[PDB]
Design a protein around this ligand. Structure first.
Ligand code: MG
Lengths: 90, 76, 132, 62, 254
RNA sequence: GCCAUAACUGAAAAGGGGCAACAGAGAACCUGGGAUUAUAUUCCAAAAAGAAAUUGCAUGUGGG
RNA sequence: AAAUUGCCAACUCAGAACUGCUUACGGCGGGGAAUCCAACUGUAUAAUUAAAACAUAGGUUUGUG
RNA sequence: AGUGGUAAUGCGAAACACUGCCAGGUAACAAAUCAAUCCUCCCACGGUGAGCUUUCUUUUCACCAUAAUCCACCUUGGGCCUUUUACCGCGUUGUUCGGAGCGGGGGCUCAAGAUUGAAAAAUGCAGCUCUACGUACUGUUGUGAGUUCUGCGCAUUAACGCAAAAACCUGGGGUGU
């Protein structure tokens, strides 16, 4: 069946720590333990090892970046900026 | 300790200078020729009781033969 | 199509990993007791060393010896190169492998031909060692 | 230390250091990365000599 | 009458860093001739965690310029740095994420990290996890680059000082609540002895200027001068303004 | 033309010594004993009760 | 339809008649309605105070390129 | 101047001999789950001795041992090779895997054991029999329960990511040429 209503992974903590600090931690505890997309290897296999360290379980590629999610949204703003600025020099 | 396969290798070991004593152990099934050389103890397991006594006669001249018995506590 | 006899390959698997080899005979279709595509390779077991000025002859002549192998290898265990070595149509007729003594007498023949390519200086890429 | 070399190695290149799936991935890139530069080096000398008769052939045109 | 705890941490005895499980210092490779004129290429072999950082490290492998050897180089990584990447390093290096090239060569409006405040000191600015500097402008009369530091405080640096390109790795870290004093035990485990933090009002008057009384109150105003001696300079040191900041966001610093 | 043994010339090795762990690293021996009043994986002598492992150095035999 | 003939271990649960109780080792929460205070687990006056104190996560401020 | 096998990789009486320089690996570390080694406990087989017996008990209790070191090589967990290509399939108690090669068919290896032997019966123990720490003989199962040895890690909760070095090992390159 379905085991809890809306405390998902945070049911670990019981009736502790306040309702909303469990919810700010919930979006990032789900994110770091979810398997992300290996754009190198085509698979959904990036699991975070340590903080900022990700590893494709299919491709054995180790990617630095992002504490709780593989690519932080400030990175994709930077990757587009570098890609644009190397087109103006070629 | 090692183990001799054939009889052509047993007579080479008993010809050696380090071979102090061959100990002869009569099991109820086989016999054992335990050559005590300076590092290893070489054993030839002869399963046939008639071929065993023929092998004892070929190590007559100048190697020490010992009939292994059960030495009691009183010899000490 | 492109795996013609007389073509330099580089052996990618086995005890001869990374050695150059030329294709002698070729079998693109699989068969019983060798259920795979394959090629009779005649490669270099031991490359000739470099000689410098100062070395005497009988030191140059010993350092410039090629050693060969003559041996059937699966097609996925070598890597074909655009480079070629002119295996004539009359020379691979003299290379038998389906014997024990006519594989020894055919390995001395390949060793003599590669030595003649090496002393004449033809196809000097084939006699350079692949450094990985 | 007391064992033979064969319990600790294997008969090919980098034996006892690298495995079969990556001895070959170095043989393949020692050929393909050397030969890719030869394609780009010989393209470079073919370009500079075509420049050596794009303008030196303009000595007979004015 | 006794010495304040903040004065005692400068003896640095029980209060030094917890460095036994730390890797080496993370810095850029040596500004040699090979980067003043050309590029050195490396290759990323491993992405590493050391205790007491939130940003990922990286060992990059160069060849030594002068000897037949290879140099293991522990750099702090940007986001997107993968093992195998072939970092380039020097003057003629291109403009890509992970590369390290002088600030004169990086066109304006570009996010950079591991930027160095003087040429050669191997990276001193923008190294905490998720931080970056933005290049505002170049001046070719003076030969200096003016960039925006992660606090917003601008700083003009020489244009021969090099920088890596990217966000610092390991970003997004402070946005998750700790929830436990247990999780703050292990956060400060690989750093140094500075936790739990006892308030000054909870102390006796012998230990701290705020301590004592029958109610836990600071008696005097808690904004102390810049010229206060060590022991007296506790509280809000030289506060230009206090209170809940209602309005914009002033950059903090001199 | 390979060694190896004795005395001149000189490539190449940046970063001086020594401590700190009888619970970390490292470490070649195991039983039997009628062998004690008391010690033993420590003593046992030609059938070492015996079976080994290991280090240094040396002869001989054999191989390059 | 090996969908069935042979042989065999190690335990557990449920059901059923029949019969007895002197309620009979050891071990093992009393429960409920509210008010005050501190969110919580934790620390803490060795030798009279373990608390509502202290810590804590969380919140804010200040100094600093 | 080593050499077999398409290949995973094999072959050691003494040349498959040596190491300025280089690079790796070993030392070198990690939960819980399940499976679990030595060993312990129990049960089952029996043999020897002992204890109980008005009655009962094919009975109760004790014992039944095998050290290192070699040598030759049936399982059940890893890795892989080759051949058939499969994009639902294989598999775990369990959170998953596969065209970046699943599953079959043949293999190559590694790790933990099992087995035959040399040691080793000559030893050990308990009995007992004969004319003095004396002798001659007699005996040497288990789909049970517990076991961290192991499987086992790029291996735990983690804003926790889990020492180092000596010593050694293999390669690269060189010498032998
Ligand atoms: Mg475990």
């Amino acid at each position: 069946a379905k085991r809890t209503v809306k405390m998902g992974v945070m049911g670990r903590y019981g009736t502790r720590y306040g309702a909303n600090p469990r919810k700010r931690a919930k979006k990032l505890e789900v994110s770091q333990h979810a398997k992300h997309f290996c754009s190198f290897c085509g698979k959904f296999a990036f699991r975070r090892k340590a903080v900022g360290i990700w590893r494709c379980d299919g491709c054995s590629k180790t990617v630095a970046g992002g504490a709780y999610t593989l690519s932080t949204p400030n990175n994709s703003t930077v990757r587009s900026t570098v890609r644009r600025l190397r087109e103006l020099a070629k | 300790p090692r183990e001799i396969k054939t009889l052509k290798e047993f007579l080479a070991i008993c010809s050696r200078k380090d071979a102090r004593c061959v100990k002869v152990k009569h099991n109820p099934s086989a016999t054992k020729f335990k050559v005590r050389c300076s590092r290893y103890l070489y054993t030839l397991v002869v399963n046939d009781k008639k071929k065993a006594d023929k092998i004892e006669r070929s190590i007559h001249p100048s190697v020490k033969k010992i009939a292994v018995t059960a030495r009691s506590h009183a010899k000490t | 199509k492109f795996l013609k006899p007389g073509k330099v390959v580089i052996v990618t698997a086995g005890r001869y990993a990374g050695h150059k080899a030329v294709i002698v005979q070729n079998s693109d279709i699989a068969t019983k007791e060798r259920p795979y595509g394959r090629a009779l390779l005649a490669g270099i077991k031991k490359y000739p060393k470099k000689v410098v000025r100062g070395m005497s002859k009988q030191t140059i002549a010993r350092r410039s010896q090629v050693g060969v192998f003559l041996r059937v290898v699966n097609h996925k265990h070598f890597l074909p190169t655009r480079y070629n070595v002119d295996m004539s149509k009359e020379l691979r007729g003299k290379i038998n492998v389906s014997d024990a003594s006519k594989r020894s007498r055919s390995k001395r023949l390949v060793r003599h031909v590669f030595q003649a390519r090496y002393n004449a200086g033809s196809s000097m890429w084939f006699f350079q060692r692949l450094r990985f | 230390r007391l064992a033979s070399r064969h319990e600790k190695s294997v008969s090919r290149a980098y034996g006892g250091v690298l495995s079969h799936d990556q001895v070959r991935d170095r043989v393949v890139r020692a050929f393909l990365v050397e030969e890719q530069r030869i394609v780009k080096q010989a393209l470079k000398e073919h370009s500079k000599m075509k420049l050596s008769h794009k303008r030196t052939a303009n000595k007979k045109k004015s | 009458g006794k010495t304040v705890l903040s004065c005692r941490k400068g003896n640095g005895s029980v209060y030094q860093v917890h460095g036994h499980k730390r890797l080496g210092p993370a810095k850029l490779r040596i500004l040699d001739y090979a980067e003043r004129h050309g590029y050195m290429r490396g290759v990323v072999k491993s992405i590493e965690h050391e205790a007491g950082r939130g940003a990922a490290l990286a060992r990059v492998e160069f060849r030594h310029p002068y000897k037949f050897r290879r140099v293991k180089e522990l750099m702090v990584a940007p986001e997107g740095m993968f093992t195998g990447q072939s970092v380039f390093c020097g003057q003629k290096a291109p403009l890509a994420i992970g590369n390290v090239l002088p600030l004169g060569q990086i066109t304006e409006g570009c996010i950079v990290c591991n930027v160095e405040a003087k040429p050669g000191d191997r990276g001193t600015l923008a190294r905490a996890s998720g931080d970056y500097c933005i290049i505002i402008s170049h001046n070719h009369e003076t030969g200096r680059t003016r960039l925006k530091l992660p606090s917003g405080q601008k700083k003009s640096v020489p244009s021969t000082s090099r920088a890596m390109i990217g966000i610092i790795s390991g970003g997004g870290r402070i946005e998750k609540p700790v929830l436990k004093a247990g999780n703050s035990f292990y956060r400060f485990r690989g750093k140094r002895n500075c936790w739990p933090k006892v308030r000054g009002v909870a102390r006796n008057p012998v230990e701290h200027p705020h301590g004592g009384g029958n109610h836990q109150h600071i008696g005097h105003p808690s904004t102390v001068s810049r010229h206060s001696p060590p022991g007296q300079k506790v509280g809000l040191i030289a506060a230009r303004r206090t209170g809940r900041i209602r309005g914009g966001k002033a950059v903090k610093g001199a």
